[PDB]
Symmetry: C3
Subunit: 149 residues, 3 copies
């Protein structure tokens, strides 16, 4: 009994792992994930940058980061309203870095941005026209998480 029951349970676990993987595939599909492309998801809730970071991390994702014009538009369509991007110059003023590390490979700043206006702006929002503007990380913007391709 012992060894047989153990061997079976191993098959039971393997079966459940496959089922859960398929469930995740179906869930990603319904969330709009295109084949071989990373995808963006939002609950349409507005919150400060720190809360967005924590939220996406818990979901094992990251704050949405556009690496090109296509992805920039994609985020825009998902968010619908101004949302935070996973880009800040919190570590060193003037040096915008990805929250995942590294300097920007792609940008789409509005004229005269980023300006660190007034009291300061260390976060980035993608406006309702695709251009970027740095804003206060304390302002409440739409939470948009990104998941791997």
């Amino acid at each position: 009994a012992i060894e047989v029951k153990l061997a079976n349970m191993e098959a039971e676990i393997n079966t459940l792992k496959s089922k859960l993987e398929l469930t995740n595939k179906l869930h990603a599909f319904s969330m709009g994930k295109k084949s071989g492309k990373k995808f963006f998801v939002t609950n349409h809730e507005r919150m400060p940058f720190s809360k967005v970071k924590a939220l996406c991390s818990e979901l094992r994702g990251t704050v949405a980061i556009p690496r090109n014009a296509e992805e920039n538009k994609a985020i825009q369509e998902v968010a619908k309203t101004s949302a935070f991007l996973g880009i800040t110059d919190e570590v060193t003023e003037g040096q915008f870095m990805y929250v995942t590390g590294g300097r920007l490979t792609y940008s789409n700043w509005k004229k005269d941005e980023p300006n660190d206006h007034g009291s300061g702006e260390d976060c980035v929002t993608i406006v309702d026209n695709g251009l970027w503007n740095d804003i206060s990380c304390q302002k409440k913007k739409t939470a948009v998480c990104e998941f791997p391709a």
Copy 2:
């Protein structure tokens, strides 16, 4: 060896349990669940109150209940049409109680309601405007379930 196989399998199970919980979190988020707020969801099907109660229970949820104006609006936008609420006055006419227990606190009655019209109306529906109207439980209204915050 057996003890090692067993320990290793317990580890796989814990990981799988954590992974499914993550799947649940991401799903709720994609469906609009806000931070620290109850999750309201509908399949847009209209049915009698008894079926709504049965359906939500099968999903391990309950018929949506607005505890305040904020939740009332949240349910209003998920339903979009007239939907049953988890409130009835079947025990003592005029005394509305939540299906999960307790006396009705927050209410948002429409003018001249509740009127227990005709043969009697013991269920409650949140109509398009967000206001409430008492209606026969046998009538078919949208099914909206609620899950914990």
Copy 3:
């Protein structure tokens, strides 16, 4: 004690099986699944018929098939644009069959369709008004899958 650990593992696995099924049920409900009815899902991605079939099959579903006017309207609403249906006359020109087997019964062909235009058209697409047209399986249309009732 080995046997005690084994029995707990079985209870852990069975609890996990039930929870995964609850997750699947809740996901179907959120996707608009009506009681005792099959449901449809789409990621809004356009691809050739062979790709759609492969995708749905991988998710344990099939390319959407309207068996009546109700299902047709439902698919039309999910798709939003022209999408492939799980119906083709690839095996024998002129005789449309469901990808899962059997000859086509209910149909909703547009005026003067099907016409196997030019070199040929063996796949079927549901257009914006809900009517059908036969087209090349090589063309890219929205991927819409159906899952069991």
